[PDB]
Symmetry: C2
């Protein structure tokens, strides 16, 4: 009955190989996705920085109360979005 044993081994051994391969593949797929995520992060944040800069400058110019209030909203929003893009960068770095 080492036919049970020797066969149980063969059975575990390929079972293990499958599990390990399946895990490594998931890992590499997550890493590839994280790489692109991180590579695109500058192109996401930079326009937001421009919007923050331009909004801030606009607040220095002659605005009506309605324009000013709208532009203050653009600015707080843009700042929020920039923070979140930074949290996205952090995510992409988690498995590092």
């Amino acid at each position: 009955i080492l036919e049970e044993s020797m066969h149980a081994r063969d059975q575990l051994m390929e079972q293990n190989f499958a599990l390990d391969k399946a895990r490594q593949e998931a890992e590499m797929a997550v890493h590839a996705r994280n790489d692109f995520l991180a590579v695109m992060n500058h192109e996401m944040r930079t326009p937001m920085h421009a919007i923050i800069s331009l909004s801030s400058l606009l607040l220095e110019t002659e605005l009506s109360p309605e324009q000013r209030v709208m532009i203050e909203t653009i600015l707080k929003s843009s700042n929020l979005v920039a923070t979140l893009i930074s949290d996205v960068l952090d995510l992409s770095r988690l498995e590092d």
Copy 2:
């Protein structure tokens, strides 16, 4: 070479494999959970960014209907184009970054 020793040798190998199997299977369950949690975070980020981008797009568009100096209009048109570009980039890249 005892009958016991021979068995010991085979059962041992079997037990070493079984232990590794348990470890590999635990690590699989963990990796599935980490993949799902990462997908959820990307979905949530996308959702959280969508509202303020739409605000920026919408307010810059409304602003362009009001009375602006030429310099102000160029700055606000640049805001609108930039915000359109980025809203789409963020959504596309977060989508592509999920693992299904």
